[PDB]
Structures are given as structure tokens and as C-alpha cells.
Amino acid sequence: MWKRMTAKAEGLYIADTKSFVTKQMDKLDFDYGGIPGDLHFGLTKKAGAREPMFSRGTEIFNRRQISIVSIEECNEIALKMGVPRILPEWLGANVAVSGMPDLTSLKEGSRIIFPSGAALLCEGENDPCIQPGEVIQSYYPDQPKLASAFVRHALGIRGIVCIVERPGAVYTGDEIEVHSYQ
Template sequence: MDDLFGVAAVPASRFKARLARTLLADGDGFVTRDVPALAVTLEGVRGDRHAGHARPADSRVPWYPRGAPIRNCRQVSLVASDELARIAERLGLEEVRPEWLGANLVVEGIADFTRLPPGTRLHFPGGAALAVEGENAPCRHAGAAVADGAPDAGGRAGLDLAFVQAAKGLRGLVAWVEREGTLTAGDEISVRVPEQRLWRGAR
């Protein structure tokens, strides 16, 4: 289907996926741990270090002063198990675990998961709904966590930077809570992808 400018529009779609694991960042560091379920409110994941309506601006948003309070659209971190396997293969590691990346949710059953467009909604049986903000760009901080966690990393120098390259387009997504509820490992996810059009720039 074309719009008024002759640009093809990808129609909206709905399909199912699976929530394989739920993890919580409730310690002092970056790493998460497995829990059976997560309670989410409009503030984010209850008890998680990334929860909150606002967050301080950082290097991801250089157009704001560092530390200025901004809307927290990064309340939940999501990864896909097949994409983690591809990152591990690129790095020559046996595995890359989601907890090393600070992930809250591990999703299965969505091809090209990291390419899901902003505005995609994920609905869960426990009433919760998440709105995808966008791709979670890989960084050296996560790469350092992989270097520390992987037993076969062998103290390899430069693995933090290698991760940034290997994880491009595969690092997963960040989302914010649109509706409160519960996320339980093993849940079926109802995915709603909005109609998409290519923006052709200012005219």
C-alpha cells in the first residue's frame, strides 16, 4: 500500500511470542538475576535499579545537560535469545548471557527482534503492557560486563570494544511501562506492530 507520496507503507501486524525469562537488577551493579516474575508499575520494574518516572540525562542524549532529569523511556531492557547467540558467535564466545547485559526480559519467537519499530506494544496475560522506545545501542559498559562474565573470555584485551561492533543491531530494545501488571516467565506475549512508513525528510 502506498501513501500520498508513493512511499510503500508496511501494514500493522499482530502476532504471538514467548517471554522466556524475567530478570531483576536489584543489586549494586549492572548485572541482573533470574526471578519467577516481575511486577511493573508506571514507574517501571518494581525493585529494579532502572525504575523511575525520570532518569538523569547521559551520553545517549547529548542535547541535554548531563544529569538533567528527563523522561525515563528506558525502564525495561529486552533481549532475544537467538540474537545473543549470534553476538556470542561473532565474539568467539560460548555464550552471551542476558544477565551480563542487564536485561530484564528474554524474548523468544520474534525474528529480527532488535528491529521491531518504536511504538510496538507488547501485551502480557498479567495485564501489563510495554511500549517499545527503540533499539538499545551497545556500549563498552555492557561489553566489559561480558568480558568479566564469560569464562572463556580469558582476559582478552579489547573485548569491551569488540562487543560494541558485534552487538550492533542485535543488542535488543528498551521500553517503558504503558500499563501496570505482572510479567511472568513462560508468558505468551501479544505483539502489536504499528503501520510503518519511511519519512522522506522535510519538504
């Protein structure tokens, strides 16, 4: 029920301010709760549109600690939107991987392990919202309705979110071991 495959962490990024657009780093520390100093770090978070069964603002466990996208799927989004490129930073990703053209399909329960031993527990698909779409729009202001275009074309290829299962440091270019749940 565990099929193993090797992939690569092409880029690492952190949201060190209130902005969700991340900035590239040569290294990141993964600890329980996520990336220390990152916008989504912590044991808890406030409920929002992603957790509609809770009243907005309700304090709940922070399930979306780390955001991952694959270079292949980002290129796929770019093509579908008719734009030259889509940067992981614009989507607020913390890790951009290569060698995973179907990353979004990685089932919950799967693990992604780094050379240091740091490990991520897959918490499923990251549903596309309008915000990143509006960010993409700002980079191509001469192209109409890109925000809604993102929400439409990114569905199923916008990446996944994970919880930190084991602490450890991660570095740019790290070869990763994916344990795909079956």
C-alpha cells in the first residue's frame, strides 16, 4: 500500500510577512507546526472559507502547515491560462517539486521525506481560491479575467498541503523520497 518514488525539491520559499506571496530561501526548517517564522506556522489557525463547517475565525488545528506545488503542474496551469509562466511564489508555495507531474493526486496519508529525515504528511489537495488568481493577474494586467481563469484551470493541478510529521532541515535541490499511499 506504499509505492516509493524519487523526486526533487526545486525550490523552497517562506512567507515571512503578512503577504502570502513567498520568497525563495536556500534552506528551511521544518518543525511541528510548519516553518518557524512562516505565515502559516503554528499548532492552530483561524477557520475560513476552506473550513466552512466552522464559524469564520474559530480557532482550529492547523492542518495546512506546508504548501507544495510541482513545476510540471504550474507549467500546466500557465498553458491553460495562456500565460508564459506561473511562479510557485505567486501561489504561496513553500516547496516547489519537480518529477511529480501528478502531484495533486498524491493521496492523503502519503509521505514526502527529505535527506535530513524531515518528513511531510500529505493532507490532500489544495483547493484554488481567487487570491492567487488576482496575484497572477497583476503580472499580466493586459490579459482579461485571469483571476477567474486561475480558479477554473488550476482545479486538480494546484498542488497539496501537508503537516510536518518529522522535524528537520530541507535544502534547495534536495532529492526527496515519496511514499505514495494506496
